[model samples]
Target: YDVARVRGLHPSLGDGWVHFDAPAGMLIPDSVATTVSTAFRRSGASTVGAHPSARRSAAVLDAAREAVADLVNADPGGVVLGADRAVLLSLLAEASSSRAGLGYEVIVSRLDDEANIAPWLRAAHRYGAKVKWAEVDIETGELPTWQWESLISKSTRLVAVNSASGTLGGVTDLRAMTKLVHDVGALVVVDHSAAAPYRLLDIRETDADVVTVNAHAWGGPPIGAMVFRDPSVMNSFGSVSTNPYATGPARLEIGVHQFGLLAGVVASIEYLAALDESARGSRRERLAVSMQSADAYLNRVFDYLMVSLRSLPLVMLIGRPEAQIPVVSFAVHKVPADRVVQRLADNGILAIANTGSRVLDVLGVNDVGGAVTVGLAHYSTMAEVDQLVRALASLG
Candidate 1:
């Protein structure tokens, strides 16, 4: 549990791989491999409630549920597991939107990650519902409350928004906005996938009916977790059946359990909970302390990244988000974003190049070749930031 000694646990970080593409996928720790191995040994039929192997597999998944719930301060009964975040979100939107006589109207945020936008849009089209938008200030990366207020009304059934945007790094006030939506008798669904790595989420605090996040964003395997305050509403989806034996979150998920991958989710949360100096009491308490530490550590590095990158004369830094995670996007003057990203990669700085971004389009940078995105996870180092800064400085 030694923080300094833990750096060697991630196999990829040991090599020359400077992982700036945290948004793409986070590096998993070797401990997670051990967990997966153990789960593979004990994997069994999920519905076999009486069998020993089934009990073992269920326990592993329950541990994952407990850890994920703790990570977001959500009720353990409410957390549902999925193989993919995008698929899970689309399922939720489809279920929530399908009501032939409910007068369904949804408000979507323009600043949400594509994961959040596309699903709601699809649901709106499929269910014959109306879609309203919560607009962002493209120049400032601010998701203002006023725009959301303009869209939400008594007829609105759902409001889909992001806790923080993946592309623009824009953070929104989900608590206030969710409350506003509830005042008009509408439900709130939040995409916390982008910020889960850098921020501590509390579903109760936000007052959202549903919150979705991906495990890979927080150093886990490729799995998605969704928390639902009222899972009965989920019965509307054909895929999600009402299991008489299971209640709440378990009832909403309709698939065979990937016990190995769920084991990795447990291991990752265990790793995150230990990141705090103490490994005492409940996992929830430990996660809170650990996430606060993560926020402090990552935000400092993000600030350093902004300062160092902005020092370069040719770098046109993207707008600083009013609230943000440890992700940034920018364009080098007169240089194509993809080319600049490739050039940086030649110097061992692995970054993601994003073009045709709706956020960039709104910001009037679409014709300039979009923006190069670099993200920081809990494991990213200041040394990597310095390397990236040096690489950007060498360009042009």
Candidate 2:
């Protein structure tokens, strides 16, 4: 597909509106919307049974898993569906109760979104396990890699981190972090919500033991998934089944699936894969190329966004300039963050306000004022960036 044609697939953008807040979530594509509708119509008929439609439903479900698996360079059998990222982590935390108590210690970073931080905190607290903080440098909004050695020791049982910061848009050296955790004899888990839509999630290459994903974060409707390499980290703990569910990842993902939304989730990846002109070969290969190409384009847009925002006097960029994610957080000198957002909204440019961010609190920036933000996706344009910069300058 042509770049323009690929951009045209987002139905909400057909009106020529610029959605600057793509990190929040992607707008649904037309083909995906139709796919959802058709799948919803096929709902409640068992995909596991012997009927013809059931078999067809089964095939659709299989394809959806395959598409999603390709998004992360994973095997479809390893991905398990659920409701949302938080609950999935909560369960994984609960399941790991034995490893969190007394002598067991968990290392968590302040840079992680509360979604990744709080669950392990709750679980550790409930189980009498000790918790260690992988503190972030408030000045730079970064977790230095060298700091990991002191944080992880023989007592450390688990380390939780995000593949990238959802709030700061800072990318982590996940493989390096994973190696540190493994050398210290601790299990490493990841929150891939922020990373998925922005970067190609080579989960296996990153060496995460158990990783939870957000379908909405990756442009699907609300769906949560857990993909793990070593099942022992979950260690028979996530099961709520009556029988020991022998079906690999399915054992961990108990309860009824959101069938209708699963349809949407399946379609979303298909939609992403369709967005590349250079797509070739298998579904997985096509997804890899598409995501990589889209990510490169997004980086260029992100660079434009950064430069334009930097040119504005009132706008102060948060996070490191070297951060790779498309997300940008900033404050307008004397203006309230919410007010800045409303003013930008008035200018036909959509922006996000950091109302309740743990990152701001960690940096102590929230004490003075909240931060307003803009996050770009592949569909974002240079004109949108100009409008946003112009809107911020208007405030001065």
Candidate 3:
């Protein structure tokens, strides 16, 4: 019932596919697959303006809410499912702009994914608020911890942080960052798309005002969930829709919910919860166990990859290997990243070329080149790691 055993429950891991592309997306389990179908059935039965089937539809929604809340350690009622993290972030930004007004500036980490940065940038532009940045140490792939007090001032209304970098796979010190931002009266938001799949997250521990994650990155369907620590923030924004029934997170959601996908979210969480239970009692307890186990397993894989890459001549590794997650990026001597990626793909090992999205830290460090990235999940095995290593070795 530990993480290793729980990993076996996922049929995809046993399949022939060598998935080093977890950062891009992951495969859903059979449990989640069934849940998606159930959600679709419920959605089909519901009529617009008419009462939805309480049993199936309501159950699905409740499950989705509980799963997201449990994943982030937030209040279940405060969890909101959106089409994607971008929409949720935009909604949060609109609310912040309305409440904070022009007197406040928004602070964003330069190391974040564009999904977390663009929404706030757009909001600040629309609301006449200034945007300030907390730059990352390109070499270390870390934020300047001391710069927190300077970057987040009285004028700062919101501070956005990325829990883990999708490209460089760096882990930010979010707990300390959130505290520093809050001290300056700024609300903190965390983009957890990369972290949630590999680490245990506690919304209370990070103390982020809002946290967002996309399910596809965590072996579910392509839906995203956002947790609002304080649901009242939704009251500050104008409804995204004019219909009274469409309000709050639901309003920001805009279109009809993808019931099947949301159902997949529920199933994904349940599978994780079940895995967690293999180590302890209760769904929450099991979730913690599952995450911790995955974290340990991932770190080992990360270390192995780093060591292997370092042994190669003419290869420059991106980011500080010590502070990273299971993702690693490296550039070949005189070879463009796109070429390396295509070559690896041709060998049937699916890795990606990093072009700044999640690898801002790496880009800032290299200054001249892109990188080929290998992203790892709990389901990844040593044999697959060897496959990647052998493939890279063959490239020379």
Candidate 4:
């Protein structure tokens, strides 16, 4: 489908407000939202089934698996739904217990959010394993490419990385990083929470052993999925499930599943797939086209924001200005990020104050202190960009 048609799918954009907060989380389309609501309603009326094969709920689960697989270009059998990314990581950590006596260390990027860091830390703590860090270039707010070779060694069991840095908007070279990790006999796990929405992600191309992404980040409901290249790894961990009948990913998922959210995710995937098919041949072809178009659109938006913001005497843009995603971060010369965010919020421009949670490397704070982040979605119009520019200009 064309950009215009795809834009029509999201009613939130038509709410007459310029949404520059896609990174923080944007609104889901009515259709997708309704589907999710329906799933929840249905699941509440009946007993929740197990896996994609369980009775009445099978179709929805199957659809979700297919949609998730389509998004990452993985096989349907490889996709697993957990309560959240943390749960999935914890289960994986437990499964990796066999390597405890082998002196295995999990390597993670220092620039990553705590979601990517904390789970591994907890898992390592439980299993008597070691955790290694790959440092980021503080000056550039980018990962230090030089430290990679030393980090991934024979002892490295799992290499966790972020496909895109949430705070700095820096896109990591996943292809190269994954290759390096795999060469040293480690499984590469990618947290694609930030990158999945803006780019075409192929798990195979990334050479990732496992990958996790939240549905809300990709215009769906508040749902998360984890994909594994090998299904046998599911057996490596102790089941968190109380029901012995329950097994595999479902065993790890625990409790009653969110069917409505899963349904919404399926619908969102269908929406994107339809857009792709309308624009290209198959869903895959359309995904490639949509991604390229998004890249071009985002580049223009970023360029405009950077050029326009640079003219302001009070603002100092954060991170590597030239090498990043369309998401821009900056703080006023005298005004704090919170103040800048308040000013923007008062002007009806929705954005997030970089509270150091989104980008620790750029913020240099364990708790808070960073610039206000203006994240752009594909549907973000030039008028919205102008509104932000005008709002910043008014601040001075």
Q: List the candidates ranked by TM-score, beginning with the highest.
A: 2, 1, 3, 4
The per-residue C-alpha lDDT of model 3 at residue 374 equals: 79
| TM-score to true structure, per model | 0.93, 0.94, 0.90, 0.89
| Candidate 4 wrong stretches, greater than 4 Å | 1-7, 14-16, 43-55, 97-102, 275-277, 321-323, 358-369
* Residue 133 shift from truth in candidate 3, angstroms: 1.0
lDDT score, candidate 4, position 133? 81
Clashing pairs in 1: none
In Å, residue 305's CA in model 4 sits off its true spot by 1.8
> How badly does each model clash, as a count of residue pairs?
0, 1, 2, 2
Residue range 1-396, candidate 3, lDDT tens digits? 244665666776755567788788776777887777777766644324346564556567777888888888887767878878877787777766753467788887777889899888888888878888878776766776778877777778888888878877778876667877788777788899887787767887767888899888878888888888887865655667546786555655566667678788878877766654446766777788877767777777777877878887867887683466687777888777788788778777788887766444435534555777778876677778888787777765
Please list the C-alpha lDDT of all candidates, in the order they appear. Answer: 0.79, 0.76, 0.75, 0.73
Q: Which window of 10 residues has the lowest lDDT sum in candidate 3?
A: 44-53
Across 129-219, the per-residue lDDT of candidate 2 in tens digits comes to 8899877776677777778777788889889988787778888766567887898777888888887886767777888887778878756
Model 1 lDDT per residue over 1-396, tens place = 233555666777757668889888788888987888888777786737788988888788888888888888876777889887888887777666553124778887777777877888887777787778777676687787766666777788878788887777777776568777889877778888988877877876777788888988877888999887665645544546446565667766777788988988989888887776665678887777777777778778889998998788998878777778888888998888888888987887789888556677788776877788989877778888999988888887
- Please give the lDDT score for candidate 3: 0.75
Comparison by lDDT, 3 against 4, better one: 3
Error of 2 at 159 (Å): 0.8
Q: How far is candidate 1 from the true structure (C-alpha RMSD, Å)?
A: 2.3
